Amino acid sequence: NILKPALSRGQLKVIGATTNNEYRSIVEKDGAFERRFQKIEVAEPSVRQTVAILRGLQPKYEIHHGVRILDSALVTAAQLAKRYLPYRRLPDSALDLVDISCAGVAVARDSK
Amino acid sequence: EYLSKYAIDMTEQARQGKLDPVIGREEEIRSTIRVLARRIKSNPCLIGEPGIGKTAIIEGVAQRIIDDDVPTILQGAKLFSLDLAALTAGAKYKGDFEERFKGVLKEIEESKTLIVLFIDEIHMLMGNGKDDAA
Amino acid sequence: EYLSKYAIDMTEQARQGKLDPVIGREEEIRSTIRVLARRIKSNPCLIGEPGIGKTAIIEGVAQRIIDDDVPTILQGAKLFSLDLAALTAGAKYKGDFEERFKGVLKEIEESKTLIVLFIDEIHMLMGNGKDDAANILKPALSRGQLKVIGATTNNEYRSIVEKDGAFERRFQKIEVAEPSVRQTVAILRGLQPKYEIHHGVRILDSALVTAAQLAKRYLPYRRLPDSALDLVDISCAGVAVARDSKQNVVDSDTISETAARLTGIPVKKLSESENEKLIHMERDLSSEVVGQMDAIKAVSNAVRLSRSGLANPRQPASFLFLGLSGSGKTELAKKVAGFLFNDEDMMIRVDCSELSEKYAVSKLLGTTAGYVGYDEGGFLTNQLQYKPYSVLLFDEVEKAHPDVLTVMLQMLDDGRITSGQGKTIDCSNCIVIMTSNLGAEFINSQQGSKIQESTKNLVMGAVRQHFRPEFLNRISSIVIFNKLSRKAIHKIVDIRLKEIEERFEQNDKHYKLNLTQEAKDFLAKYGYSDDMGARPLNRLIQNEILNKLALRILKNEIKDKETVNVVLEECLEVLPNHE
Ligand SMILES: Nc1ncnc2c1ncn2[C@@H]1O[C@H](COP(=O)(O)OP(=O)(O)OP(=O)(O)O)[C@@H](O)[C@H]1O
Ligand SMILES: Nc1ncnc2c1ncn2[C@@H]1O[C@H](COP(=O)(O)OP(=O)(O)OP(=O)(O)O)[C@@H](O)[C@H]1O
């Protein structure tokens, strides 16, 4: 009855999260969970939105790595993420480019 | 008493207004009652898709009992919902959990009104492929 | 006295009248006694399907002992029901399990006669992973008589033997038979007074006969010793239950109807009206399906024969629907379900469109153990096990490969279809409707809307070329649907327009259907693409009416209702504005 009697009574508020195909498995294997949880579709952000996110996270990266990030750099990460990493969704794809680039600067400092 | 630890008094909850009033399903509640009113193997099980309302029927049973819509045969009755915990509270010390279960059964038959026990998720009764099902 | 702490004295129960007497089991009882009389292989094992009187024999033995129908050799023995608490009373303390079996296995022979132990479920011994779980005490001590009688399910016996070995060598396997209906009734009669007394109702003797006979036909999943009693006990309760809510058990009005409430099977409800079940069927099927009256009657009549169980106990109502596509070859089937279950969606559609002999049977019946995924029964087993009188539809059964057709051969004649699991279904109470397009080559000649004799034979030729006659010979009727004469089309257009209204959810916008004879003729005339049946009428309506309507709705040019007129096939009907 994992979470069951409580979810069924409005008690034990639970916020779940999973991947579309994982969900598919929930729906097929249990079914009743789909009747216990309210599905909320989460949408991939656009490039513009992705950049806004990156700007917001920019200080976490600058502080962590000890680097300064140009705004055009973040725009670039989002554009390149969409164009060159088509199989992986934008939030991480852009962040990987930003985070790794920042890391590279830091690593490079210790290379000399 | 094991019922005070391992089961919910559905009829208490009905009495307390904690259960939704049942709407319709008159034939299903009558069918349920006719089976419970049997003398031999009086054990109905509600089958249907999840999301159908079969629990609501069980709540309906409790409501019928509270307001005595239940036939004379079954009016002097109580309805409890057995948690899996009777068995799933831990099997440490093989057989103990089966004994708690049997304990519950002793309480149910022993005199104190026609106590009927509700088994939710009856699939759990399957045990470990018979074997542990005892 | 371990036995007085952990076991029930079965002869106590016999003496106290707590056990039911048994009928017809005398030889099987004698067999267990004769085995006990042996010095070697002295422990009988009652083996059979669940419910096949295995403990009835044992309970019967206890009575035969107190009644002295047992050799004195054995008669002086006492019988006890063991296991369970015998073991589970201990838990902590390794070896307690042996200590629990040990004094039992000593007291059993210590002066106070010989005690026969009953392990009703031998299969629950041996040990869960062996673990020397005191089971070893049995073989170890088994030389000292310590006679044990036990029982197991046929399936379980196999498991006992394979798991232990010694048990096969120590026990005498005994097959226990399922009784015939005649024997079953005799059993029921013996128990009749127990139920009459227990419930305070009477039972008609014909009712007992009915329970056994009815159960044999409509409860194939439960063995007669139980199935017949279930109908008796449930019925008796039904009488007492109704009586004692805020008399006797009638063969018909109580048992036949009870079984139907339990299992489904409308024909055993012995309904008060074949007007509101058959007559209305023809009318309503005819009301919605225009033309093909011949088919409607064929089905209605085949269905009629199932009333009261008159139809053959091993043959589903069965049809093969041939004819022009668009003639309602599957629409009729839905309407039949629409009548039978008062709901068209209750029909079990079988996707015959997708068949290969290598998957074709397996997706219907599933597979055996050892194969990726068991969940057997995709389309047939999983439905028929729960819906005894469902109606099946095979959309293009003709695309089936011989393996499926073989399943259908069984279905159509002794429908004890074996699932991949190995368990049968027994769906003789279902309705089987199958379809095919084979007659297209002849019916498309358009030479007469009612199938003509030449056409009929040519169509049946193709059917007989395609399916083996063995299949065809098992179908209740083969019907070639009539083509949709213009006459039919006018009636159909009205029906379709109403259907559109009926399906239009929340009909704020609703059809006025100011068809007038002119648009009726427009749809009926221009939509009469005879060689495609009625289906094109739908396309015409979508193209000419609904598209415009949808646009006017989107533009909010319509607030409610729905104006119709003809503006002037070039007129295109054209619905008017509204607001
Ligand atoms: N006929 C009804 N009368 C009153 N309440 C109902 C009725 N049908 C549904 N409900 C309400 O909605 C729920 C019906 O779902 P129910 O609890 O029966 O789930 P369920 O059918 O048991 O499915 P499950 O197998 O996930 O338990 C009830 O909890 C009740 O609140
Ligand atoms: N005799 C009829 N009266 C009213 N409507 C009909 C009639 N025949 C056909 N229709 C309409 O046309 C369609 C007939 O569907 P149906 O699938 O039976 O055609 P079909 O011949 O089965 O197609 P196919 O042979 O490929 O399964 C239905 O959608 C129904 O609305």
Question: Measured from the CB, is residue B53 less than 6 Å from ligand 1?
Answer: yes
**What are A29-32's contacts with CB under 8 Å, separation 24+?**
A31/B50, A32/A4, A32/B50, A32/B51
Residues C220 and C247 sit within 8 Å (Cβ to Cβ): no
Amino acid at A92: D
Question: Measured from the CB, is residue A35 less than 6 Å from ligand 1?
Answer: yes
Technique used: cryo-EM
**How far is the C-alpha of C569 from the C-alpha of C518, rounded, in Å?**
12
Using the CB atoms, write b or e for C196-211: b if 16+ within 10 Å: bebbebbbbeebbbbb
Ligand with minimal distance to A34 CA: 1
Query: Chain A: nearest CA to B50, how far in angstroms?
Result: 6
Dmax of chain C from CA atoms?
112
Phi, psi of C480 (to 5 degrees): -105, 120
Question: Count of residues for chain B?
Answer: 134
* Encoded tokens for C339: 């009548």
Q: Can you give the three-state secondary structure of chain B, one letter per residue? A: CCHHHHEEEHHHHHHCCCCCCCCCCHHHHHHHHHHHCCCCCCCCCCCCCCCCCHHHHHHHHHHHHHCCCCCHHHHCEEEEEECCHHHHCCCCCCCHHHHHHHHHHHHHHCCCCEEEEEECCHHHHHCCCCHHHC
| Alpha helices (runs of H) in C165-292, residue ranges in sequence order | 166-170, 181-199, 205-218, 224-243, 257-263, 280-288
**How far is the C-alpha of C51 from the C-alpha of B7, rounded, in Å?**
31
**How far is the C-alpha of C76 from the C-alpha of A84, rounded, in Å?**
91
**How far is the C-alpha of C9 from the C-alpha of B129, rounded, in Å?**
30
On whether B51 is known to bind a ligand per the annotation, the reply is yes
Residues C405 and C466 sit within 8 Å (Cβ to Cβ): no
**How far is the C-alpha of C35 from the C-alpha of C160, rounded, in Å?**
19
Using alpha carbons, select from A99, A32, A25, A89 the residue that is nearest to residue A62: A99
In sequence order, what are the residues at sequence separation of 6 or more whose Cβ sits closer than 8 angstroms to the Cβ of residue A96?
A: A81, A85
Helix (H, G, I), strand (E, B) or coil at C192: helix
DSSP state of C152: E
**How far is the C-alpha of A86 from the C-alpha of A90, rounded, in Å?**
9
Instruction: Inspect the interface and report whether the beta carbons of B34 and C87 lie closer than 8 Å.
Output: no
Amino acid at A22: E
Instruction: Tell me which H or E stretch contains C248.
Output: strand C248-249
B61 backbone φψ class: left, alpha, beta (φ>0; ψ -120 to 50): alpha
**Hey, which residues does C203 pair with through a beta bridge?**
C249
Residues B46 and B32 sit within 8 Å (Cβ to Cβ): yes
Burial of A15 by CB count in 10 Å (0-12 exposed, 13-18 middle, 19+ buried)? Answer: exposed
On whether C139 is known to bind a ligand per the annotation, the reply is no
C395 backbone φψ class: left, alpha, beta (φ>0; ψ -120 to 50): beta
**How far is the C-alpha of C191 from the C-alpha of C392, rounded, in Å?**
40
**What are C276-284's contacts with CB under 8 Å, separation 24+?**
C277/C307, C278/C303, C278/C304, C278/C307, C280/C339, C281/C339, C284/C335, C284/C339
**How far is the C-alpha of C167 from the C-alpha of B44, rounded, in Å?**
38
**How far is the C-alpha of B32 from the C-alpha of C396, rounded, in Å?**
41
- Partner residue facing B84 (CB), from A1, A31, A35: A1
- Partner residue facing A35 (CB), from B51, B84, B121: B51
**Hey, which residues does C322 pair with through a beta bridge?**
C480
